[PDB]
Swiss-Prot record, chain A:
Binds directly to 16S ribosomal RNA. GO terms for cellular component: cytoplasm; cytosol; cytosolic small ribosomal subunit; small ribosomal subunit. Residues 1-24 are annotated as: Disordered. Disulfide bonds: none annotated. It holds the Pfam family Ribosomal_S20p. Belongs to the bacterial ribosomal protein bS20 family. Keywords: Ribonucleoprotein, Ribosomal protein, RNA-binding, rRNA-binding. This is Small ribosomal subunit protein bS20.
Swiss-Prot record, chain B:
This is Peptidyl-tRNA hydrolase ArfB. Rescues stalled ribosomes. Can hydrolyze peptidyl-tRNA on ribosomes stalled by both non-stop mRNAs and mRNAs that contain rare codon clusters or ribosomes stalled in the middle of mRNA. First identified as a complementary ribosome rescue system when the stalled ribosome cannot be rescued by the SsrA(tmRNA)-SmpB quality control system or the alternative ribosome-rescue factor A (arfA). Belongs to the prokaryotic/mitochondrial release factor family. It comes from the Bacteria. Associated with 70S ribosomes and polysomes. The unstructured C-terminal region is required for ribosome binding and peptidyl-tRNA hydrolase activity. The C-terminal tail functions as a sensor to discriminate between stalled and actively translating ribosomes by binding in the mRNA entry channel downstream of the A site between the head and shoulder of the 30S subunit. This allows the N-terminal globular domain to sample different conformations, so that its conserved GGQ motif is optimally positioned in the peptidyltransferase center (PTC) to catalyze the hydrolysis of peptidyl-tRNA. Residues 33-66 are annotated as: Disordered. It is found in: Cytoplasm.
UniProtKB/Swiss-Prot annotation, chain C:
Changing K87Q: Confers low-level resistance to streptomycin and a 15% decrease in the translational elongation rate. GO terms for cellular component: cytoplasm; cytosol; cytosolic small ribosomal subunit; ribosome. It comes from Escherichia coli (strain K12). GO terms for molecular function: misfolded RNA binding; rRNA binding; structural constituent of ribosome; tRNA binding. One of its GO terms (biological process) is maintenance of translational fidelity. Changing K42R: Confers streptomycin resistance but not hyperaccurate translation. This is Small ribosomal subunit protein uS12. Belongs to the universal ribosomal protein uS12 family. The modification N6-acetyllysine is found at K107.
Curated annotation (Swiss-Prot), chain D:
SUPFAM superfamilies: Ribosomal protein L14 (SSF50193). This is Large ribosomal subunit protein uL14. Transmembrane segments: none annotated. GO terms for molecular function: large ribosomal subunit rRNA binding; structural constituent of ribosome. It comes from the Bacteria. GO terms for biological process: cytoplasmic translation. Part of the 50S ribosomal subunit. Forms a cluster with proteins L3 and L19. Forms two bridges to the 30S subunit in the 70S ribosome, contacting the 16S rRNA. In pre-50S ribosomal subunits interacts with RsfS, which may inhibit association with the 30S subunit.
RNA sequence: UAGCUAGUAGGUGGGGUAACGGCUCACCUAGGCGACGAUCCCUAGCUGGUCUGAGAGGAUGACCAGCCACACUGGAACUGAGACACGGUCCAGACUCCUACGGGAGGCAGCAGUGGGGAAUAUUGCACAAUGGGCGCAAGCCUGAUGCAGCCAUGCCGCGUG
RNA sequence: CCCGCAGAAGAAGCACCGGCUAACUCCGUGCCAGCAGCCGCGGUAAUACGGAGGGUGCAAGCGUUAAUCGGAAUUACUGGG
């Protein structure tokens, strides 16, 4: 099995950990958002939300995130924030 | 083939002695007898009897050509 | 014909049984062919039909007829089997093909040479 | 250090699982058995498609001992099990191929170098 | 083969996927399915069609074509438009291979070929001429797909042996 | 594919032949040996066994075995008791 495709493994592993770092980064901001949600402070949560807003978009446009999930997160949270308003 | 016999049914030597005889020589005799012959047995009159069953059937079965 | 239960229970078509349990889809089978002997036909006949017990490659043990006026079988020397009854020996349902793997064809035959596996004498 | 009726485990892929000592070869009235020695054993547990069956008797050489073996310096290597590998009952040839679990360094005895080559560690 | 089932039946809400959904959880409700056959067991890839038959039907599904499924066994995920993947990777397992005994390699249900099994089924051939696919504005470049030759009367058809 | 050279030169076996089912006699072994899809043939004139000649059928194939359907209204709805 002497093939040049063996480079596609090491190349992909570089991309694997790269997206991996980007993935948990998103979850952290969600937990940052959910933190204030546990507290109930709307302004703090609003601050938490407005800080990750520009981040999720630059990850949505980067190709790692499809538009749907990006739009979905902005929906549920903000509506729930109105509950904690 | 070490043929071993043990005799315990008696008190004296001579009786345990003679009992060992038949337990050996007769046991030798019984283990030597075998089947012999007679096979096969041939039909004597069936070779005559069956003739009727064939000719009676052949003669009667002649109702064919139309 | 009381079509009501016909819908409840359709016309149960009987399954077509076999005649050669040697092995379906397999026209022929090889066997070690042990036990070489001869028996006697049924009531209407009188002869000495030579037969053999055959252990199949399928694990089965069948009895077949040795067709010919001269054989060279030795309780071994694998042969080939085929379907076909004789209506003379109750129990047999297979024929043994002369001119087989390890069983020569009959010697000194002229007619039906395609049968008995005997090669046509061109000389 | 193995003796009579000691239940061992097979380290090869021969087909056995649970063996039992029926006799330690070599030397008259010898009691124990070193980690790199041979003993007559039997099969008390085997897999369905194994090359050998239950109740069969043949030779085998031990490899791992819970008592372990010492070293020329003084250090010792104990195991958490007692294992062995099957041999040819008349030619000493190891019938099993894939050996599991590490073996000893002292077994560089040429007749087991075959085993050491297929041995995983040590 | 007579009762079967408990994320199983549904609702609310969080989460989750490209997207609907017990897809996944928390709570409430105890229901749902079953003689028009459930569950359980065995068997089998499906269809267009193919063989036969007056028809209705019975059998079959190699090959030409479309769909699904698998890639040594089983499990998993990443990358990516798209796989949770034949000629990628990681783990476990089984069976082989090399050795420098440290430490690594291997997956023909791809084309040929090999052993075995079996009643029985072929060359370890030539080339991108042709059609098609992959990169590029373009030129070229690659392909045992494919196009051909060979082995065999296996079948269909045709002619000859005056 | 088309054209020329050429000795009629280099090119035929297989099954069956009692009825079903086209197609026969003689000799040999004599319920022995053997044939057979079916019924059955064979005990010294065997058209069925074996050989020979002749005949019939088919054809670069011919027989045998295996498989499905049909015949089979022997699963009958078409179309049975």
């Amino acid at each position: 099995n002497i093939k040049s495709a063996k480079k596609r493994a090491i190349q992909s592993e570089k991309a694997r950990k790269h997206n991996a770092s980007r993935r948990s980064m998103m979850r952290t901001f969600i937990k940052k958002v959910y933190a204030a949600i546990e507290a109930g402070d709307k302004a703090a949560a609003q601050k938490a939300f407005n800080e990750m807003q520009p981040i999720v978009d630059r990850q949505a446009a980067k190709g790692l995130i499809h538009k749907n999930k990006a739009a979905r997160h902005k929906a549920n949270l903000t509506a729930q924030i109105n509950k904690l308003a | 083939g070490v043929i071993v016999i043990k005799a315990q049914e008696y008190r004296s030597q001579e009786l345990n002695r003679e009992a060992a005889l038949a337990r050996l020589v007769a046991m030798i005799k019984e283990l030597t007898t075998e089947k012999k012959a007679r096979r096969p047995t041939r039909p004597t009159r069936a070779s005559k009897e069956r003739r009727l069953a064939s000719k009676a059937q052949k003669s009667s079965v002649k109702a064919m050509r139309g | 014909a009381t079509v009501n239960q016909l819908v409840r229970k359709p016309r149960a078509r009987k399954v077509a049984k076999s005649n050669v349990p040697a092995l379906e889809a397999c026209p022929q089978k090889r066997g070690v062919c042990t036990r070489v002997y001869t028996t006697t036909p049924k009531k209407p006949n009188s002869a000495l039909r030579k037969v053999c017990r055959v252990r199949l490659t399928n694990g089965f043990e069948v009895t077949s007829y040795i067709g010919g006026e001269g054989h060279n079988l030795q309780e071994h020397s694998v042969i080939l089997i085929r379907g076909g009854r004789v209506k003379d020996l109750p129990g047999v349902r297979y024929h043994t093909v002369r001119g087989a793997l390890d069983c020569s064809g009959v010697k000194d035959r002229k007619q039906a040479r395609s049968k008995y596996g005997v090669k046509r004498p061109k000389a | 250090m193995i003796q009579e009726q000691t239940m061992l485990n097979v380290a090869d892929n021969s087909g056995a699982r649970r063996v039992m000592c029926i006799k330690v070869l070599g030397g008259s009235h010898r009691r124990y058995a070193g980690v790199g020695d041979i003993i007559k054993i039997t099969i008390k547990e085997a897999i369905p498609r194994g090359k050998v069956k239950k109740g069969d008797v043949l030779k085998a050489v031990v490899v791992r001992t819970k008592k372990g073996v010492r070293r020329p310096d003084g250090s010792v290597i104990r195991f958490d099990g007692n294992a062995c590998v099957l041999l040819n009952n008349n030619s000493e040839q190891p019938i099993g191929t894939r050996i599991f679990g590490p073996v000893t360094r002292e077994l560089r005895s040429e007749k087991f170098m075959k085993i050491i080559s297929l041995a995983p560690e040590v």
